[PDB]
Amino acid sequence: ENLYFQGMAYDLWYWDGIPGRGEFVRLALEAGKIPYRDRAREPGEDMLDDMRRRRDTPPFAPPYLVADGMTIAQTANILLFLGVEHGLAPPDRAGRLWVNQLQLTIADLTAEAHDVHHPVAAGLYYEDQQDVALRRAADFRETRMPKFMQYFEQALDRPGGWLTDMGRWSYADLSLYHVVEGLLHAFPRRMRTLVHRYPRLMALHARVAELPELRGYLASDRRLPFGDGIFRHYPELDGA
Amino acid sequence: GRENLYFQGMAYDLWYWDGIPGRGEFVRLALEAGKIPYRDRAREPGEDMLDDMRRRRDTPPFAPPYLVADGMTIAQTANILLFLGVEHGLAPPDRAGRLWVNQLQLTIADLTAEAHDVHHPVAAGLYYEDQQDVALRRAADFRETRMPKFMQYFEQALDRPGGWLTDMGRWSYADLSLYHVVEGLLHAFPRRMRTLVHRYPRLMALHARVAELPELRGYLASDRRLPFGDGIFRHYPELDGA
């Protein structure tokens, strides 16, 4: 590597090994063609030591992005920055606030997808909370997934095939693609039932998958598969 | 004259559930302290929020609260507050300061959701009584690991001169939110807070400082400030502990 334009590179800090929350940021950086370093994936990485450093603006948890001497944490907050700085969101306030709330709603769904298998405690193993997971999964499948998906289906009721009227994808379109990917992995049977209800959502999902901007990244070693992150396939939690 | 007047159509419309302070309280504190005219529409006789939300078609809210302001319908508590911070100076004027306040608010929102999920760990739509056994388990973790982690975080975020979360030289909306989440925890987990509060002198100083703001005096003593009950912050003795 070591080519000139990488002097502008942002530092992204998020766990190696799973897509996780970091994936929402990474999708925007890749599609936006914004130079960055995936610091925790580098051989001599020390995210432990980096995150405990004295900062004026300390991250509570990953992901965080270091840009212009700023340390920016919270997935939606990092993307808000990229939206304004790199044009991944509308130019006007109304548009940016719309994209921000969409991203926050996507983050809500994403958290629910994690909490389905960790309903008692993020810090306890799934195995010790499986009985609770079975109960929470029934609600998540029966009420939560349709509610969120109907909402995004209605958000997409506009000319041009994106979440906004900006005439191109926003970072929220990328994030919506990703949460659908996550749900397809974690709940394949339930999605099989539900996808027919949401043709605009599934057209959006398909359209992002085929973006020229993302072709390279999605086929690359930088795109990690799902596993034991947010979106986990436990067949006992799935259902028609 | 003393009283700030406004003509028809000037007030923002805040739409949030009546009965509980809930998520709407974070917005209400900022509008009140910032002296931004607003109507708490869902509390007014004859108004129907569920009806109002149905018609909201260009930028529909997923759920309350939402704010109808300056031609926009703005939803998500942190998003509503982001607008107020930028347009009414309730957050720093600079980019880095705004991003800092926004992440602090989102972190406050994480803690707030966890305070709700302690008693609704299975489903927001099901009654507490039907998921009480699960709640006991979730509560043990929330008290033991989560509450101190968030509180320590805010204690460190406050380690700067000036007695606020930012370097702007005054309270921001995240400072008001931080006061409110501490009020909520004091109500819901009084025994655990008895153990914890001594650890966080800057946080408790912040809490007391906001409580005393002359711009909040009227509001906090008014009928407009609803007490906690069966909203987000709920006092269940069985979920509390040292």
Ligand SMILES: [Cl-]
């Ligand atoms: Cl994941």
Ligand SMILES: [Cl-]
């Ligand atoms: Cl269990």
Ligand SMILES: [Cl-]
């Ligand atoms: Cl409440």
Ligand SMILES: [Cl-]
């Ligand atoms: Cl609307």
Ligand SMILES: [Cl-]
């Ligand atoms: Cl139970």
Ligand SMILES: [Cl-]
């Ligand atoms: Cl102690």
